A and B are shown apart, each in its own frame.
Chain A
């Protein structure tokens, strides 16, 4: 299962990427707070 272990290492890299994506989402929440509120309203309307 060395390939499965490599897949687990890839999953750990994906988890680091997910943390970076979460940081990017946090950055979107952080910079342009107005734009974040506008996107909140837009997602609510799309909902």
Chain B
């Protein structure tokens, strides 16, 4: 694959540091280091490839660049020269911060409302008020709902008080918030991943660690057990969903997993069978005894894997 980002990357690794420095100063740290690694280790070089890269650069120069004067590269310096020639007020610099602020406001709208809230909860309530006013109404309502009641009411009250609509101080406020997400994204919290990791573990060790974390913190252990939970009760799992998964899942696999599963689980899973399938499954459960628990757990894990596959499809909310 060669995306528009990747085409520019190939251009850079082909041309050299003379333009790479300008690209870096107009670029971001991870892509700078990506091109540095590309320079350190390169195996995408070919006699035709390099010429095609030059042709693609010529296309960008005649289209994306349109053979124009430096775009905000040397122009910003002449803009600063005009600013210096005019009153001693760096409005252009304030506009630069506003540009990042407006882009950050759009990013804030894109990114998760609760993460935005907890990144702004520590900040000033007036900061929260003005940023919520300047954000999209839908994103603002999402963050409002994700706020606690008292903080939310204070934010709306200070929104009502907010009339100063200030002017360059607002831009640097957003810049500080962006810098508090500018740091490496991380997001390795994996609130689901503990649960996911324990599910990936063996079932007996899963139960042992569940008991251990119940001793550690009933709250955290209960959250982990909830993350273990996958189609255990019909009302939360949704019958239509039990209907859709289990026709995709092999009937024999469901049977083997059910005869090792609890009778409530058997009943709630068979309630979404075609009646012939439910009767056949129950009759075979009566016929054959509990097969090896290893095979029963294998069928249960296959059921969970198909649940995860349909979660990947995203047509309905699993449990």
Contacts and interface: CB of A to CB of B under 8 A. Distances in A.
Interface string B42-54: 1100000000000
A42 B227 CA distance: 45
- For chain B, the bracket of interface size reads under 10
A41 B42 CA distance: 10
Interface in A1-47: 38, 41-42
B49 to A, nearest CB: 15
Query: B-side binding surface: helix, strand, loop or mixed?
Result: loop
Interface string B26-66: 00000000000000011100000000000000000000000
Interface of A: 38, 41-42
A27 B43 CA distance: 21
4 contacts: A38-B42, A38-B43, A41-B41, A42-B43
A31 to B, nearest CB: 16
B46 to A, nearest CB: 13
Nearest to B42: A38
B43 to A, nearest CB: 6
A42 B42 CA distance: 10
Contacts of B41: 41
B306 to A, nearest CB: 38
B16 to A, nearest CB: 14
